[PDB]
């Protein structure tokens, strides 16, 4: 009596068949593609939504109510553990982790002789899983380390975010990058896949974060570990990068122009594509909100006058370490780093190097009627006429999203050397001078600004002399701030250094005058440097998850 058995599921593959050897490449491609198709407008893997808490940028939109929870994060007041954005980002990052784990589970049950690339594929999956764990560790201090691919779904409920201490969790994250560095090929013809240089750089980043110990219940810095810095220096060695064939591009803008995707400086990048059979293409929907009002709507991710003043330089050619924010940057009478015109689109200047679009201080460019200023971020946006861009209910581009940049690797190595302080400050100064020299030379697309708008560019390297450790650290912080503006790492760097509270309070006090949203802002010493663990997740795992300190 096969009446109840005649019908079978349609258009799907069952769990038993998904383990077949011929689906392993499909699962690998799935684990890659979750990184481009699993991000929403309000939760992008660039983490710019949660980087508004820093001093680089405001939150765009019509007003404070447009994404009220993100305004709550930005002013660090009225943040609730029952906020949808927190739970959403938690769930999305763990979704990426689980897709990678499924790929790993399929790979681990395959004959290496029959599938020669087994080790390389496993390394790639481990790299992706570690990347997601790194993002989760940055956002929430206490995370669940899901690194067991052969774990039954019923066993997931027993997982806890307090199984390992903070140092152990960092080590577990770094283990995947260590394996990936050991097993990945030196050079990848297939650009999407990570290379050994990328694995090494990201492992160095993991050790760099691990060095700044967060021991104890509070989130305060508890000393700097020398072994981790030694490992950072070991894994950031220029020999590895030369073997991978990576280096700084001749111009700064090439890292963000669509014509130079997968450049020399692009150590690893999320690949976004257009015209590929998808309904609208694997576009960067995460940055869909950040487009200016001229492109049509949503005007999010607006840089800050504090950031512009930071870009402002002195007469000699060095950043104003103390008096940069005293007065607003003046185009005609101040020397300015050329990186400003690659990072921030100021009014009265071409938008993304298009003379047909000149930014104006009218409602055609600001959605909030001047509440959030009139500055427009340029790093993630593209020229409207390069047909890189498409309207899929949100203007999204095919510009790749660079996760690791060779400039980041150089600044990481400089930070490791300075923190080590073993008589090698000169090498860090050399690296900083190299980055600044690249920035100074990066004026191929802004050369006419001198005679068209009276812009004075003045950037110079440093003399190779002995520097005090604190002075070198201050200069390094300034270099990172002017180099990675709008790239969504300022808040994470502030937390890592520990001065997040002081910097954020100073920024609040300074910018409350020019932005009315900071009237009631306030940063708590040991509560707001990490997102709370979601209340929904804590309730679901009863007696297993512990909320961060201060909540």
């Amino acid at each position: 009596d096969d009446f109840l058995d005649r019908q079978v599921p349609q258009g799907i593959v069952t769990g038993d068949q998904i383990a077949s050897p011929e689906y392993v490449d499909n699962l690998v491609i799935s684990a890659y593609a979750i990184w481009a198709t699993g991000d929403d407008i309000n939760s992008s893997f660039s983490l710019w939504n949660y980087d508004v808490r820093s001093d680089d940028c405001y939150k765009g939109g019509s007003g404070t109510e447009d994404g009220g929870v993100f305004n709550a994060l930005e002013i660090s007041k009225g943040i609730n553990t029952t906020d949808w954005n927190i739970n959403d980002i938690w769930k999305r990052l763990y979704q990426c982790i689980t897709r990678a784990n499924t790929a790993l589970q399929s790979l681990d049950q395959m004959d290496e002789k029959t599938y020669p690339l087994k080790n390389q594929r496993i390394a790639e999956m481990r790299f992706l899983r570690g990347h997601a764990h790194f993002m989760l560790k940055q956002l929430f201090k206490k995370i669940v380390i899901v690194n067991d691919e052969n774990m039954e779904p019923d066993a997931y409920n027993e997982l806890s975010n307090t199984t390992y201490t903070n140092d152990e969790q960092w080590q577990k994250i770094a283990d995947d990058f260590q394996f990936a560095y050991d097993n990945l090929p030196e050079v990848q013809i297939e650009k999407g896949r990570p290379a050994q240089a990328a694995a090494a750089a990201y492992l160095a980043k993991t050790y760099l974060y691990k060095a700044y110990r967060q021991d104890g219940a509070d989130n305060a810095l508890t000393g700097i570990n020398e072994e981790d810095l030694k490992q950072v220096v070991k894994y950031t060695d220029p020999l590895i990068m030369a073997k991978g064939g990576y280096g700084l591009e001749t111009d700064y803008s090439m890292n963000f122009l669509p014509q130079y995707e997968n450049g020399a400086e692009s150590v690893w990048a999320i690949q976004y594509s257009i015209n590929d059979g998808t309904y609208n293409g694997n576009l960067n929907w995460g940055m869909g909100l950040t487009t200016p009002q001229i492109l049509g709507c949503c005007d999010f991710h607006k840089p800050s006058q504090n950031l512009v003043n930071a870009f402002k330089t002195d007469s000699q050619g060095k950043p104003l370490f103390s008096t940069y924010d005293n007065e607003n940057y003046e185009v005609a009478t101040d020397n300015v780093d050329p990186r400003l015109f690659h990072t921030v689109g100021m009014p009265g200047f071409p938008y993304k190097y298009n003379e047909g679009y000149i930014i104006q201080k009218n409602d055609d460019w600001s959605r909030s009627k001047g509440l959030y200023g009139y500055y427009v971020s340029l790093k993630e946006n593209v020229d409207p006429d390069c047909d890189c861009l498409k309207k899929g209910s949100y203007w999204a581009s095919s510009l790749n999203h660079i996760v690791i940049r060779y400039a980041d690797v150089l600044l990481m190595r400089a930070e490791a050397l300075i923190q080590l302080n073993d008589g090698r400050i000169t090498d860090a100064i050399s690296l900083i001078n190299e980055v600044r020299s690249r920035a100074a030379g990066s004026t191929m697309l802004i050369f006419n600004y001198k005679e068209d708008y009276g812009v004075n560019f003045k950037v110079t390297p440093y003399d190779l002399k002995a520097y005090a450790q604190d002075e070198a650290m201050k200069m390094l912080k300034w270099e990172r701030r002017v180099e990675f503006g709008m790239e969504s790492s300022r808040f994470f760097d502030l937390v890592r250094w520990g001065e997040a509270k002081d910097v954020i309070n100073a920024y609040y006090v300074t910018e409350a005058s020019r932005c009315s949203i900071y009237k009631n802002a306030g940063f708590t010493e040991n509560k707001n440097e990490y997102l709370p663990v979601p209340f929904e997740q804590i309730s679901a795992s009863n007696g297993n998850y512990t909320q961060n300190f201060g909540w």
């Binding site: 009446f3 109840l4 058995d5 019908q7 349609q10 258009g11 593959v13 069952t14 769990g15 068949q17 490449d25 499909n26 491609i29 799935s30 593609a33 979750i34 198709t37 991000d39 929403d40 407008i41 309000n42 019509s62 404070t64 109510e65 447009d66 007041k77 009225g78 609730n80 553990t81 763990y94 979704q95 982790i97 689980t98 897709r99 499924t102 997931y156 297939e190 995707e261 976004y272 594509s273 590929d276 059979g277 998808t278 309904y279 694997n282 995460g286 049509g296 409602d363 001047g370 309207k391 949100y394 095919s398 009315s516 949203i517 009631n520 929904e536 997740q537 309730s539 679901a540 009863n542």
Partner: protein, 924 residues
Amino acid sequence: RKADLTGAVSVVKVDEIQKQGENNPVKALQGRVPGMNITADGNPSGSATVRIRGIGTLNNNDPLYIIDGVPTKAGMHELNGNDIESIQVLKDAASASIYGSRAANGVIIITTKQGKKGQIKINFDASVSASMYQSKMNVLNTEQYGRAMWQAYVNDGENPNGNALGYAYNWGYNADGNPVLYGMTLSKYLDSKNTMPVADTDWFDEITRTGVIQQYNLSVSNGSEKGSSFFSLGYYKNLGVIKDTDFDRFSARMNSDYKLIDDILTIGQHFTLNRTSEVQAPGGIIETALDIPSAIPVYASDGSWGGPVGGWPDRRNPRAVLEYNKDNRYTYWRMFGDAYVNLTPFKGFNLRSTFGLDYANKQARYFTYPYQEGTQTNNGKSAVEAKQEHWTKWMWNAIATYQLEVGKHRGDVMIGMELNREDDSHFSGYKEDFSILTPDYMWPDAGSGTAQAYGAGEGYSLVSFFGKMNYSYADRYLLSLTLRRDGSSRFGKNHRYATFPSVSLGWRITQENFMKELTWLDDLKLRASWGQTGNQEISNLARYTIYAPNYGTTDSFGGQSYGTAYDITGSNGGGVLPSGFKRNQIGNDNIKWETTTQTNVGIDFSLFKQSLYGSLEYYYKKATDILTEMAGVGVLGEGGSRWINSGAMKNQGFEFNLGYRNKTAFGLTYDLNGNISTYRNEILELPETVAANGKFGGNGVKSVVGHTYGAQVGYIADGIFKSQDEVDNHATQEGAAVGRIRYRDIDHNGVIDERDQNWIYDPTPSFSYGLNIYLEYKNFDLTMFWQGVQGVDIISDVKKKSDFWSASNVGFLNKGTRLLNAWSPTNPNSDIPALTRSDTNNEQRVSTYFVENGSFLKLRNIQLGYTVPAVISKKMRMDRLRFYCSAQNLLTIKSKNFTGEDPENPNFSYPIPVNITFGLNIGF
């Protein structure tokens, strides 16, 4: 005749069901059945949602319709309702178990008209009605909008002239220093290009109209012992109050039966063919009309559609949306047939074999015209969708019945076997890049752009063996025993089949000899029943670990497509990307039937020679092992959803039906049918992840277990602050100021935070009642049906968008009129919070401010009819001629605590119009 005669059965009188003149008979019987909740939005189609005995399970709660013995769950709005002979609602598990394995939520047995033996009749009914839009939300006009924005600016302390929306305010201060607005002026053109003149636009009036309803039915029945037949034609058409939305339906029904030999081999059939064409309103059209400010003109300077320009908020033109949507018309063919053969070898035996067929076919063609309304545009995107769907359900039934009349013992036994098979499929084509942009030209061949193809199929099967035994002693003691063995294709082999027993007892006390002298008590029956029924209404692929090759071709909002396609080479596409698979759900091989146990106790009474009749019922439903789709733990990632038997629900309820019919000395025949009901719902057990994410209640803050289904948790609003002294004395909270909402400190910790929340919402009415009044006098009949609900709370978003300025996601949206009477030092006697541009206090949070008293009492139907005298009718050869004029939804009474309007429909769903109808019936 209550068919079962020993269970919770409600008989509905079609002679007044037809009076309401509604397309959907289910919608017509909205409040006429105790322990039943009918919710209808008011769209032209009669589509409505039914809940019998409250919420019974965490799955589909739709009741099972049985038309002429063929079960179906499809809505009745696509079937002709004017050819219904009897309606019986079986609400007890014991009574309704015999009619199918999907009877957990109640059964509605519908018997269509049949040829009355030995006579031939014909009826023609015509009806024309006008539907008017009464619940017109009062939104701010241009001047009121300017005044409100000025008030918000001055309350925040900012310069109102900085509004940058073209308003220029002349304003000053009074003696006390409170700002006052002397006047305002406007810039004529909202944009620098002089394309959008400022205007005062009534958007609700612009998108609404006066709808027309047409109904024409023609039935002819012809019956004899030689055989009987019945043929019906029907046409219904409804233009909705919202423009460019409508629904029409053609229907044809053909029933017949033939008795051969002498009484053996009775062959009958019932078939019906329906064709419904519909254009539906776009999602949130009422929301868009409410949001868009009244300053935006309908048409621009050049005749194109007007839209937001400059600093105005981005909302599409609702009139333009309706105009572009007017071509999204779908056609739907429904085919409900059955054929039965009955064999009677001797006096007591019967063998009935029935075959049923239900074929539905939906064909639609959706268009995407390019639009450019001010700054709102889709970059000139033009596309077409051609979508086709097929549903095919067939049932085969076999019944063997025996009856016996030994002495005073009357016993029947029936054994039955039933097979059901449902197969659904659908597929769609999608094309782009059109040139002419008209429905005639827009076809996938004519398209010249990217193309997509979607398609899926599914199905399931059910097998059932049932046995029903009824015994009766002295026509006074009644006993019923039913047993079912049901299996479904949705379960594994081990857990495929399940057994469900049910027992019923009944005692006709009036038959007992000891109460003969009580002659006034015409009849009294006391019945009890305990039954178990099975539930398996889940997804077809419930026990499998599904991996799907989601390439990402499906359209998604926000880009969270979760597709499986990566440009792994790094070339910005240009071809077919490598694809893979993604997990949709985790299989569970231990799922089995959900068990619903129902205990019912009823008392039926009739007094004064069937002049005062009624019933009183008490029921207790307990659903266990509820098949719920529990979500993943969170670190389980995508596809963590899985079905599991981890539920428990309880429903205790009381029902009371009453009816008094009597004549009058001067010749006024009055009939009153009253009804009142109440119930309590509770959740007893629930999976941890379900309780945590709060899809069934609690908002994810507290577990709903032990509380009503759908209950919500929020803050408590203790008025608003009226002075800095009050602000200081209250417990500290972020954003507190003068004129802001004061939230109670529940835990007395001195600070307001996310822990200061409590149960505030309970979606269960205290009681729901209905009353039907029928008066006959000198050929004039007046019918009045009232329906009331008492003790119900409703969460309102219209209140959120009318009592607050800048509470929506985007600012400067149009608001409700009652916003004007907000609190201010000039206007102290108020409870609406003061206007502000920044939601510092975060008043969007769930709180008792948005909880309103939804109690109401509305005259659902009224109808005055005149019957032409028999002598004139016979002279005209008509056996019966009748005219009538009726009104539906004419009058309502609501509690004063309800700020909005139409408590039945308190949100942005389709409005409920007032229908004024004139109709006639001819009975040649």
